[PDB]
Paper text:
SARS-CoV-2 utilizes a trimeric spike glycoprotein for attachment to the host cell receptor angiotensin-converting enzyme 2 (ACE2) and for the subsequent cell entry step which involves the fusion of host cell and viral membranes. Given its crucial role in the viral replicative cycle, the spike protein represents an important therapeutic target and is a critical antigen in host immune responses. All emerging variants contain defining mutations within their spike proteins, with multiple mutations clustering within the receptor-binding domain (RBD) impacting both ACE2 binding and antibody neutralization escape, while mutations within the highly antigenic loops in the N-terminal domain (NTD) across these variants reduce antibody neutralization. Given the rapidly changing mutational and antigenic landscape of the SARS-CoV-2 spike protein, a structural understanding of spike protein mutational effects and the discovery of broadly neutralizing epitopes is of importance.
Numbering used by the authors:
A (entry chain B): 745 to 827, 856 to 892
B (entry chain B): 14 to 69, 77 to 145, 153 to 176, 185 to 241, 257 to 298
C (entry chain B), E (entry chain C): 992 to 1041
D (entry chain A): 299 to 620, 641 to 675, 691 to 694
F (entry chain C): 745 to 793
């Protein structure tokens, strides 16, 4: 809150503008990264109620309806095992949205193979 | 009034290991569940500290150089240690400290005293014998504070002269080992700071019978520690950054 | 003295932003690789070895 | 937004323009209790004062001196300082204070000053030319004077050499006015050095006794045990204020804390080594200091060719501390929250997006 | 005098570390490409043109 | 080897720690690069005589 320090800091030009601009570029690039990784399908697919996949069992990778976050057991294990003018900006996609995107990808690749990645 | 003693049996002082004691709070700052590293005058872990004995005949009251920092440990029972002597030459030519604890309260005085070559007390089994000085010419600061007080009780003390502030640290520790120091960790809190602002480079610890008494002397050295603060804010463990490579 | 503090803290901030940009470039390369893996291994079957 | 982008036309998007800062309202200072007052009552209003040739030097140290009470007392007829400022006594710090108390005539008061030549300055009490401090004098007609003449107070009248600074002379050696030898026996030109004052109440202004106490400061390398008083204001909590606690100054919001300090500890620091809790010197309680709720201000706008309506996001700011809707990204004002879901147009953060259809969130 | 020398040499060292980090990112990209070539051309037959 | 210069350098904080950490990261990164390019098989094969 020092006024004399800020008065001196105006003599240094637009260094602060450069740093804020670079950090803003990094911040939007993180969201762009998450979009390009996960938001690859515009149809949200759901798995059928009957899990008859010819003996194949996807319960460890499919979402658990019991959990409040609707995460898979492996996803829940991953989230459990990974633990002055500065502000932390929240990501655009929440963990629930990324879980829904992953769930849509899993449902598409289980019920439709590779066809959902190239069209209907 | 001073008296020479000659009934001592001559014996060199012993040395003993320091173990993992001597860590004190470097500042008045609270910390919780964090690891803090600081550069301050610290006693290296597992070093030889001078050992002074008093038993019957031993009555060790030598005069030692202060250097830049001194560690006092005292496996003390029935309170045989009653004071301390701090100064440069310990006579009326110069100015020294008088830090004592008699039967009523503790007195801190900064005066030009005339200390005896053999300063000692005496208790009749009631104390009525005070032989620690012969004159007191010019005082410059007087201070009265609250009293600080098989070997049962342990007293730890650290003394420094940094920029005219005389920092005293202390802890009372319940011990049950008879002969030597115990093994364990104990953080020393700051008890009193004395704004003395004087030169100090030498010090002394304060028929007949020699009561069961013992104490230790260690020296502080500039180095770096890594101190662990718990949730309640007490220093539970420390790491010397220059002791051995694992700690580094 | 304030100018000395300003240039020191400004140098620290610029160093932080520069290393953040470098880490962001590395993370962006990793995320582009992750998107490529998502497209070619999840949305299809890949003939590329390893 | 136009000013920040330096263009009159702004395309659709969200732009960080300003930085929100909750300005402090009050200025709070707490300092510990004013204890251990200096024993000024046994000095400046004692029973009897000393002579000028054998002045008692009283040393004031290890206490706080409240110079306001002494300065506001109107009974001191002369309150003159020569090296410091009277209006700055209550802020500056000094190692120790030496009080030189003596009794002289009402006209000889001025001679206790640098650069003055006289009987009192040369033979009774001398100050250095680089003296600092204050010379304080007050009338003592009603205390020292007696109907039969107060002859107790003696002063040195003849000495062979001028006095050195702060030098006493308690010897009664016989002065030799002429050149004839004197071995301590008075003669034609040999008189006693010390003379008694003729203090009588009937005399006017000019002969009345004045009790004069002179304070001299020392600036040695020892700590300044003598400092001025401290004025602590009231405590206001749960507001962004300016706090200065025992030299630790800054801005924050002060609330009650459940952390338990050890009794010696005063300050508290987090993992990042920034102050987060301080113990109040007046009342032994621990106040958690959270920073005042700053945030980056973002402006949500469609293209200026479409509309001039804008929505404002205060990133990481609670809506109660600033069409007012609370998101996990911050407080969003100017956008009406809808319960329906669309495709993202302008990203806000934490799953929220803004679009123009009025601006909807 | 030592402060002048310290700020100059620290600026030089930070600059050196900055281009070292940038060239390390470039070399890491090249090594990732080389590992991909090893996997897809040495450990298999690639359909990717050129 | 100057102790006064190092004392003055300590007042600049942790710049040296950052530079050393970045250089160490680059150094281990080079080894990781070599491992990921060449150590793709944990099986050592020899051509027949
Ligand atoms: C698919 O796999 C899951 C887990 O691998 C099976 O769930 C187990 O079911 C048995 C009996 O129903 C339980 O004793 C186990 O505790 C379950 N495992 C877990 C992790 O909960 C499931 O039965 C399999 N088959 C189908 C059709 O879902
Ligand atoms: C106890 O012994 C010491 C050491 O012999 C005495 O200290 C000396 O005292 C004489 C005076 O008699 C001085 O001339 C010496 O300079 C002293 N020595 C030192 C090293 O200072 C001490 O006086 C003795 N105590 C009594 C009461 O005589
Ligand atoms: C301490 O000193 C004694 C003799 O001076 C020596 O025997 C001992 O080994 C020393 N302690 C250590 C830990 O080196
Ligand atoms: C302890 O020392 C103080 C300081 O001189 C004195 O006033 C007091 O009477 C002493 N008490 C005893 C029991 O000797
Ligand atoms: C110190 O004491 C001696 C003897 O008691 C005395 O001559 C001298 O004046 C004293 N010093 C001061 C500064 O009073
Ligand atoms: C203190 O006195 C000792 C002599 O015992 C001397 O070596 C040292 O230089 C003195 N220090 C100061 C600061 O006067
Ligand atoms: C901290 O103090 C509380 C006192 O209620 C105690 O219950 C707790 O065990 C202490 N913490 C540790 C780590 O001992
Ligand atoms: C004399 O001075 C002392 C200074 O401490 C003051 O407390 C006292 O009130 C004064 N006496 C009178 C009668 O005002
Ligand atoms: C200081 O004064 C306050 C208010 O009277 C009191 O609560 C407190 O106990 C006093 N003492 C200390 C050491 O703060």
């Amino acid at each position: 809150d020092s006024t004399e320090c800020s008065n001196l800091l105006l003599q240094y030009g637009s260094f602060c503008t450069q740093l804020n601009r670079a950090l803003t570029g990094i911040a939007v690039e993180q969201d762009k990264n998450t979009q390009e990784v996960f938001a690859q399908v515009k149809q949200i697919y759901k798995t059928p109620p009957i899990k008859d996949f010819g003996g194949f069992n996807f319960s460890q990778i499919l979402p658990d309806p019991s959990k409040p976050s609707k995460r898979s057991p492996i996803e829940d294990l991953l989230f459990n095992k990974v633990t002055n003018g500065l502000t932390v900006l929240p990501p655009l996609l929440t963990d629930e949205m990324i879980a829904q995107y992953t769930s849509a990808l899993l449902a598409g690749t289980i019920t439709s193979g590779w066809t959902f990645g190239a069209g209907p | 009034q001073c008296v020479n003693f000659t009934t001592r049996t001559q014996l060199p002082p012993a040395y003993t290991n320091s173990f993992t004691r001597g860590v004190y709070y470097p500042d008045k700052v609270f910390r919780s569940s964090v690891l803090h590293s600081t550069q301050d005058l610290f006693l290296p872990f597992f070093s030889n500290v001078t050992w002074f004995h008093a038993i019957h005949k031993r009555f060790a009251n030598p005069v030692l150089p202060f250097n830049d920092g001194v560690y006092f440990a005292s496996t003390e029972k029935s309170n045989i240690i009653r004071g301390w002597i701090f100064g440069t030459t310990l006579d009326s030519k110069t100015q020294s400290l008088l830090i004592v604890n008699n039967a009523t309260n503790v007195v801190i005085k900064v005066c030009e005293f005339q200390f005896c070559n053999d300063p000692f007390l005496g208790v009749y089994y009631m104390e009525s014998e005070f032989r620690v000085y012969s004159s007191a010419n010019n005082c410059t600061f007087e201070y009265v504070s609250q009293p600080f007080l098989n070997f049962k009780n342990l007293r730890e003390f650290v003394f420094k002269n940094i920029d005219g502030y005389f920092k005293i640290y202390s802890k009372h520790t319940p011990i049950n080992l008879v002969r030597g120091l115990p093994q364990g960790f104990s953080a020393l809190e700051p008890l009193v700071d004395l704004p003395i602002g004087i030169n100090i480079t030498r010090f002394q610890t304060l028929g007949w019978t020699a009561g069961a008494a013992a104490y230790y002397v260690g020296y502080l050295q500039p180095r770096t520690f890594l101190l662990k603060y718990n949730e309640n804010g007490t220093i539970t463990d420390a790491v010397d950054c220059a002791l051995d490579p694992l700690s580094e | 003295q304030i100018d000395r503090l300003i240039t020191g803290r400004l140098q620290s901030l610029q160093t932080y932003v520069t290393q953040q940009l470098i880490r962001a470039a590395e993370i962006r390369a990793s995320a582009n690789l992750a998107a490529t893996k998502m497209s070619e291994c999840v949305l299809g079957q890949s003939k590329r070895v390893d | 937004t136009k000013c920040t982008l330096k263009s009159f036309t702004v395309e659709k998007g969200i732009y960080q323009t300003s930085n929100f800062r909750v300005q402090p309202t009050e200025s709070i200072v707490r300092f510990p209790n004013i204890t251990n007052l200096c024993p000024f009552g046994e000095v400046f209003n004692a029973t009897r004062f000393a002579s000028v040739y054998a002045w008692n030097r009283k040393r004031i140290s290890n206490c706080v001196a409240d110079y306001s009470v002494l300065y506001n007392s109107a009974s001191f007829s002369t309150f003159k300082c020569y090296g410091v400022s009277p209006t700055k006594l209550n802020d500056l710090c000094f190692t120790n204070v030496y009080a030189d108390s003596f009794v002289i005539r009402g006209d000889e008061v001025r001679q206790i000053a640098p650069g003055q030549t006289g009987n009192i300055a040369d033979y009774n009490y001398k100050l250095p030319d680089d003296f600092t401090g204050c010379v304080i004098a007050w009338n003592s007609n009603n205390l020292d004077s007696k109907v039969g003449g107060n002859y107790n107070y003696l002063y040195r009248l003849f000495r062979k050499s001028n006095l050195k600074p702060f030098e006493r002379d308690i010897s009664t050696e016989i002065y030799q006015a002429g050149s004839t030898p004197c071995n301590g026996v008075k003669g034609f030109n040999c008189y006693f050095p010390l003379q008694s004052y003729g203090f009588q109440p009937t005399y006017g202004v000019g002969y009345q006794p004045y009790r004069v106490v002179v304070l001299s400061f020392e600036l040695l390398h020892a700590p300044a045990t003598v400092c001025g008083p401290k004025k602590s204001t009231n405590l206001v909590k749960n507001k962004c204020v300016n706090f200065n606690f025992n030299g630790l100054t800054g801005t924050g919001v002060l609330t009650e804390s459940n952390k338990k300090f050890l009794p010696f500890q005063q300050f508290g620091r987090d993992i990042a080594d920034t102050t987060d809790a301080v113990r109040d010197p007046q009342t032994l309680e621990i106040l958690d200091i959270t920073p005042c709720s700053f945030g980056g201000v973002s402006v949500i706008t469609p293209g200026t060719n479409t509309s001039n309506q804008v929505a404002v996001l205060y990133q990481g700011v609670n809506c109660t501390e600033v069409n007012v809707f609370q998101t996990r990204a911050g407080c969003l004002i100017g956008a009406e929250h809808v319960n329906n879901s669309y495709e993202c147009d302008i990203p806000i953060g934490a799953g929220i997006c803004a679009s123009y259809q009025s601006i909807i969130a």
